[PDB]
Amino acid sequence: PFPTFGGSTGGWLRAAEVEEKYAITWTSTKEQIFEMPTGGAAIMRNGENLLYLARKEQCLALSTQLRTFKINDYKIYRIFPSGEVQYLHPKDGVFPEKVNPGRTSVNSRGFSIGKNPNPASIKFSGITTYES
Amino acid sequence: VDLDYGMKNSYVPATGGDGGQGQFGAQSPNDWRVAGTSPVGETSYAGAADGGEEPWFAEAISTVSLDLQKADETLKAFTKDAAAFKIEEFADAAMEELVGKLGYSKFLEMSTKQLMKTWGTL
Amino acid sequence: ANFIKPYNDDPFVGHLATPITSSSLTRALLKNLPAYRFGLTPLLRGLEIGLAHGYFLIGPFAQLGPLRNSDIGLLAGFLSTIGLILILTLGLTIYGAAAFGQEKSNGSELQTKKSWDQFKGGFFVGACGSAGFAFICLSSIPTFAL
Amino acid sequence: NVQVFVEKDAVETSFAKWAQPGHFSRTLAKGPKTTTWIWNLHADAHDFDSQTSSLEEVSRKIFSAHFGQLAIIFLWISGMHFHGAYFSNYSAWLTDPISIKQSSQVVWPIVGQEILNADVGGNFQGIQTTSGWFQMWRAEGITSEVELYWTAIGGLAMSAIMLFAGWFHYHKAAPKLEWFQNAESMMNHHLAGLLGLGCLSWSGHQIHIALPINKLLDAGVSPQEIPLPHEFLINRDLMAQLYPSFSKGLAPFFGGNWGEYSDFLTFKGGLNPVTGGLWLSDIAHHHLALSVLFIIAGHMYRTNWGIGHNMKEILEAHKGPFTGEGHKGLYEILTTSWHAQLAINLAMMGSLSIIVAHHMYAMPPYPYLATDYATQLSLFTHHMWIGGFCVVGGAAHGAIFMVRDYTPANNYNNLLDRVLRHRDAIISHLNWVCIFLGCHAFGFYIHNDTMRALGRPQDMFSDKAIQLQPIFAQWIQNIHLLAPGTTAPNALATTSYAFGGDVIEVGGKIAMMPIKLGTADFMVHHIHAFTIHVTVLILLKGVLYARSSKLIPDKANLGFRFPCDGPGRGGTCQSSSWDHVFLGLFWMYNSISVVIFHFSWKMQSDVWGTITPDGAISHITGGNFAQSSITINGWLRDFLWSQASQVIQSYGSASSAYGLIFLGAHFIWAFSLMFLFSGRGYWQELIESIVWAHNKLNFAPTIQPRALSITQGRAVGLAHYLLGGIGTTWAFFLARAISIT
Amino acid sequence: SHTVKIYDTCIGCTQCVRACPTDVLEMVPWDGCKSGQIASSPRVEDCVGCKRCETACPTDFLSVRVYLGAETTRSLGLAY
Amino acid sequence: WRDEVVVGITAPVGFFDPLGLSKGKDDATMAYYREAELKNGRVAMAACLGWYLNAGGVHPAFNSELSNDPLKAMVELPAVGWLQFVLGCGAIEWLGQQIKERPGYVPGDLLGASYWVDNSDEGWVMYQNKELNNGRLAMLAIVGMVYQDVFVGDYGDMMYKQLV
Ligand code: CLA
Ligand code: CLA
Ligand code: CLA
Ligand code: CLA
Ligand code: CLA
Ligand SMILES: CCCCCCCCCCCCCCCC(=O)OC[C@H](COP(=O)(O)OC[C@@H](O)CO)OC(=O)CCCCCCCCCCCCCCC
Ligand code: KC1
Ligand code: KC1
Ligand SMILES: CC1=C(C/C=C(\C)CCC[C@H](C)CCC[C@H](C)CCCC(C)C)C(=O)c2ccccc2C1=O
Ligand code: SF4
């Protein structure tokens, strides 16, 4: 289910084999040319498409481009060398820009940015002002 | 398939100036520092591909793939809590009705009142 | 009709099969070089590589070094070549230490500490001996006249 | 079907929008809220494709703006002719071109600046000018200031005509986009009409006017006794006295016995011994043959009569087993993108300017140009700089094409697509080539400096030591020296004496002599190769990584010109293709500086100088190039320190303006480093304290002051860098060359 | 990994989330503002530190703040 | 082998073996014959180009001291140059034999173009035919030029110089 692509020198390197790799799948309703983030143009297949990339940012750039094609079913995974997979995006089946019940807020501080403590007040504690 | 496989890395978060390991882990559990290419008949590292008669390009051979079945299964495994939340708020068999009637991705995408509407049909 | 295709029939790997990377000449040459040739002991890979390099390394020193116009110019060139080989051997030694650690190697593959030590020793011997052989050969250059 | 399609009364003529600064931009139209607005207004003024999404409107704006540029150029030429007519010693210089210094600028007596009116000879005081006007006018046959006045009047008329034409073709009769997309017809007209008829008519002027006037002027006839130009037209006997084949007339031309015209259409080569310039008969034959060639070339493309070539067909046919679809899609690119066309045309025009510089020094085309060392230096240097800027601009507009007009759908598996698909290989190999060239070429100099400093001259790379002879260049020089009798049997002398031959002497000064190439020439030519390769590396990286990279996968969405993508990923400052143009400009400056220094020193050391009637040659710097140019210390001492003497000792003479400009250019160059080394965060914070002081006294602009943008900081820094460095070299060259000429 | 904090001046405009190139941020329910949502950064392991989110944020001063810290492969944006 | 080979068969003469030197030869023998035809043709093409350059006077090596006559320059070249030429060709031949052992090796295909294209493609067959025919012509031309230089004394152009 690979798109029609003649190859490039911009693809993944040894890291994809030994550290981590990324995959993006999506469904197209016709054969259409798109821009590979790694350089050059590829032809989407009618139906399911799968593409491997070195970085998550490359997958998200491609997904941003897919949105201009009216394609919103893309899924982004991370694959480890052992073959374990992580489903990354959209994490809960809903795009992060659309508020969703069941998400919990992470990393909020209940005050305006001007109320962080003074550095001299936490010297030698090992913490930063934004984490305390 | 373990869900914390990414988190079980060797990255030890520092006490300051460090966001730590987030939802999936700060880094891969696999040591990227492996050997360079190797002679004909030998492997550079544990899971390395045998480059056959061209070991110098052995690293260009892919041993990491994503077959569609693994994709669907990890999609379900990683979103099991979100689906559990959606059935908890919409309300076992009911979830099997909804996720086969319209789909699993669609079940995640819809709303509890909307699913209360589609449950009206049977 | 098309002399370029994705390497390993994989469009998404960062490599292309071209005549430079995938011709029969390139493949035969690379598979036959001692760094890759099937069946060699690490010591023999190191020895062949050292023999290849030490022979040509003496030339720049003998012909262009500071003492090139003295009558001991060849001897000085050989000494310079030996010094260069020592520098390279130090590089190989510390490389092996970094890349493989100091634990006992579990295998006989070249990319292991014990095998790399054998390879480094073979390289040192081959290079120094080859520099000496080139010194002998340069001591008497044949004109090739009957 | 090639047809003229024009819309009438396209745009009203009114001053309303002149009162609405920024009207062209939707964002800038709302008016300023900070001083940034002001800068943006000038930056986006001619960025037509960002002011509208219609290609037809962009084409119309471009056409009219081109007319405006033509009007400006005609005004400039007319002004030069008027200054020749009223503020020059051209008449006096005509009588004795050797001892009188050309001068066409005069300054008013105020605050003591009249010292700049040098004693240039001919009962005239002024500034010695180096743009070659007198030589060109004498070559044209101009013998009186009245002819110059009429040429200036016509220049004014043409400037007004171009201005009206621009107004007319924007506001009254604006062509449709289909008109502009007529590549075939445009090529046919510009080859056959513009270039072919231009060459034919100029050859007509040269044959009928310039040739006999110059034959008389060389023969020693006074300018006040030479017949007026129209007499040569109305008196075939006057021409028959000079060139006898004119007594046969045009009968040989239509009969085919063209050999009869061998007396005024020649193939002599070499230089005219009296003037030191090319033979005007050779130049006339050259222009006639070129006119024929261009007129032929202008019938290649099909317009309306069935015959001719379609460019898209030719391009589509050229594809091979290594290149996929090959040239398919290129025609669409070059007929829909103004940036693609501008990239090609700037690259070509700049390269052509560089070629012009070389060819004009080695085969001096105008009389008394070769021994006017100031003019030769200034023309070579000027055209080198123009060419460098134009090649860099071509690169910049290629990058703009990649960002804005490149569409993946129209470039599947063609040459552009495959270049993008192996950009990593291209850039890695170019990087390696640059390192190899730099290390070896510059390490030669560093090795030599170290050897000489250690008292080991015999270990240097030099002619007297380890030698690096440019044997290929020498082989070519010998071939060209032997050409006149054998491989160009009808040529009587060499194309240029730089390749070999005698010394051409004019007024006791050397016009041209063989330029020998040794170890120092090898080293400097490899320095040139190095600098050009690095400049190409920067610019080609800017084009090939314009849309994306492994660092920033979505660069095209950030645009052609953006400062960065933030401090993340380690830091992404200057990742945009505009920043690649920015760095390439510095490298082009480095390259051209080295080229013009090589020219200046080599010509002074080995070519220019005096020559006694006996035959003894005394060069300007005594032949020191070979042993002094092989170390950096020799360049610092024997070139810069030694030849700067004139510019630094110029105070109190007519050259004092050069000393002042030398200093001011140093000042502006150093001033640029404030912008190049700093960042706007500091300056905005300082401006906060200054705005505080103004607010403390109850006043502050509603146009809030802002430090320049990141990209504007870079642009300003680079502009002042180039102005300072180039102006320093300008003052230095001009003082030196006026002294030695 | 970089640190990304959301302060309570957030008006839930979702602009930082749309700006993020690596999907670090997401909108979550919250009763502190009119829009009924606040920004969140559950996936800081993928934050590169580009600060596009800060460029997008309309509040004065910023409601999302990125503090750069310990570098990883992911935060350095390495394809190798 | 005759119903398998297409390269080398071309217009005028079609298949050309009047002596019947290919009948009853095994596939290995005919592969040897094709490899030899190609190698002799390629060597002869290179020899023709080198001879033409030398005869024209374009031999700038050794300060252009060697004679314009190629058969004289052959003996004026020192022994060590010929030793290098022979040993370098020998090393290339050793590598070529290694290539030849490989499965699916096409006789004369050192580049291994079979990894990308085969004779089912028309243009590749046509370009192979161009190579082969020019090789045949160059073999004849090198023999003829050697004859003309040895027995007729003239080492240059005797066919087209008479025109101009
Ligand atoms: C970078 C340019 C450069 C070059 C070409 C030279 C060249 C030289 N230097 Mg100098 N030098 C330089 C810069 C350079 N120098 C610099 C920057 C300094 C510091 C200021 C010096 C300071 C210096 C000193 C103090 C001395 C020299 C000396 C020398 C001479 C002997 C050096 C030697 O034997 O190396 C040995 C070279 C090698 C071991 C290898 C050379 C590289 C090989 C040939 C590349 C082969 C690649 C191959 C073609 C690739 C494909 C092969 C195949 C497998 C496909 C030689 C002429 C000595 C001398 O006496 O001069 C007369 C000397 O005493 N140099
Ligand atoms: C090609 C460009 C060009 C250049 C660089 C020069 C340069 C010069 N000319 Mg020459 N000249 C030219 C073309 C040129 N000229 C042409 C085409 C003609 C024929 C008309 C002349 C005819 C001529 C004569 C007769 C004389 C000169 C003189 C001069 C010198 C003094 C100029 C001066 O200070 O005037 C005074 C400068 C001003 C009054 C500055 C006013 C600037 C205005 C106000 C700003 C305009 C900005 C914008 C357009 C307007 C916006 C606002 C507006 C709408 C209200 C100077 C070297 C003089 C000279 O050489 O003396 C020995 C002199 O006598 N020129
Ligand atoms: C900022 C731009 C700039 C400026 C200020 C100058 C300034 C000058 N130029 Mg230069 N020039 C430039 C760019 C510039 N040039 C470029 C980009 C080129 C490459 C085409 C040239 C090629 C050039 C030539 C060949 C000559 C000059 C000359 C001059 C000097 C006399 C001016 C004049 O009116 O001569 C008028 C020009 C002529 C009388 C000769 C023109 C002959 C060329 C071949 C005509 C080409 C026109 C053609 C239609 C252009 C299209 C190219 C085609 C491939 C599409 C003056 C110093 C002249 C000089 O040095 O005199 C002493 C001179 O002979 N320039
Ligand atoms: C045929 C020539 C030509 C044309 C028609 C264009 C046209 C354009 N360029 Mg290109 N470009 C060119 C050559 C050309 N360029 C060259 C030779 C270079 C290399 C330097 C470039 C490099 C370049 C860059 C990097 C960019 C452009 C951009 C543009 C576009 C915006 C222009 C604008 O609004 O600036 C308005 C004009 C000004 C603000 C005037 C600037 C004054 C300069 C900086 C200094 C002048 C110094 C003066 C001569 C000396 C004074 C000395 C005295 C004070 C003592 C416009 C489409 C921009 C773009 O975005 O394209 C889409 C852009 O970012 N160009
Ligand atoms: C004089 C100051 C200077 C120097 C030495 C350099 C050097 C370099 N620049 Mg830089 N550059 C400079 C000014 C300078 N630049 C400025 C002011 C800017 C701002 C505009 C830039 C912006 C810039 C860009 C955009 C690029 C460069 C690139 C390069 C590299 C070019 C490739 C090369 O030739 O490597 C060879 C090394 C040298 C030529 C330096 C000395 C070599 C010695 C003499 C010989 C070898 C010695 C050897 C290493 C032994 C050392 C002994 C030691 C251990 C004791 C080279 C390292 C380019 C690059 O990286 O391309 C690959 C590149 O793209 N520079
Ligand atoms: C001396 C000038 C500069 C020389 C630089 C390097 C010297 C090495 C020899 C290279 C010349 C031949 C190139 C291959 C021969 C050639 O001319 O093209 C031959 C071949 C053309 O293939 P086709 O027959 O498919 O072409 C059909 C054409 O119609 C193109 O559409 O091109 C290729 O195989 C790919 C070209 C990239 C090959 C990369 C080789 C390395 C290039 C070096 C960088 C060039 C610098 C120039 C930039 C302007
Ligand atoms: C058809 C393919 C062809 C080949 C393969 C070929 C080869 C050679 N030609 Mg010939 N030749 C033509 C065609 C061919 N020539 C044509 C169409 C013409 C009419 C213009 C022509 C005329 C001359 C003249 C006047 C001379 C000449 C020479 C040589 C000699 C040196 C080659 C070199 O170095 O360029 C080599 C053997 C020179 C010579 O024989 O010197 C003793 C010499 O003076 N040629
Ligand atoms: C391994 C690297 C290498 C070096 C370092 C090297 C160097 C020289 N070669 Mg050699 N070369 C090869 C490789 C190398 N060559 C190979 C693989 C082949 C077979 C294809 C080959 C063929 C020839 C032929 C035909 C001649 C030749 C020569 C010289 C000579 C020139 C200076 C001189 O001797 O004056 C210098 C020392 C000429 C000659 O020796 O003339 C008496 C000569 O005619 N070579
Ligand atoms: C000095 C400097 C500044 C400060 C310089 C500024 C703000 C330029 C000021 C330009 C003036 C205000 C316009 C010209 C006006 C004259 C200087 C004075 C005339 C005053 C009135 C008539 C307008 C930057 O903003 C900056 C930004 C990014 C990188 C480097 C730098 C940098 O180096
Ligand atoms: S703001 Fe300035 S320093 Fe920071 S990344 Fe952008 S260009 Fe670099």
Author numbering:
A (entry chain D): 8 to 139
B (entry chain W): 47 to 137, 148 to 178
C (entry chain L): 2 to 147
D (entry chain A): 12 to 752
E (entry chain C): 2 to 81
F (entry chain 3): 32 to 195
From the paper:
Diatoms possess unique LHCs known as fucoxanthin Chl a/c-binding proteins (FCPs), which differ in pigment composition and amino acid sequences from the LHCs of land plants. LHCs specific to PSI (LHCIs) bind to a eukaryotic PSI monomer, forming a PSI-LHCI supercomplex, the structures of which have been revealed by cryo-electron microscopy (cryo-EM) in various eukaryotes.
In this study, we solved the structure of the PSI-FCPI supercomplex from T. pseudonana CCMP1335 at a resolution of 2.30 Å by cryo-EM single-particle analysis. Based on this classification, the five FCPI subunits in the PSI-FCPI structure are identified using five genes: RedCAP, Lhcr3, Lhcq10, Lhcf10, and Lhcq8, corresponding to FCPI-1–5, respectively. The PSI core contains 12 subunits, 11 of which are identified as PsaA, PsaB, PsaC, PsaD, PsaE, PsaF, PsaI, PsaJ, PsaL, PsaM, and Psa29. Psa29 exhibits a unique structure distinct from the other PSI subunits in the T. pseudonana PSI-FCPI and engages in multiple interactions with PsaB, PsaC, PsaD, and PsaL at distances of 2.5–3.2 Å. Among the FCPI subunits, only FCPI-1 contains two BCRs in addition to Fxs and Ddxs. At the stromal side, I138 and S139 of FCPI-1 interact with K121, G122, and F125 of PsaL, whereas at the lumenal side, multiple interactions occur between I109 of FCPI-1 and F5 of PsaI, between T105/L106/T108 of FCPI-1 and W92/P94/F96 of PsaB, and between E102/W103 of FCPI-1 and S71/I73 of PsaL.
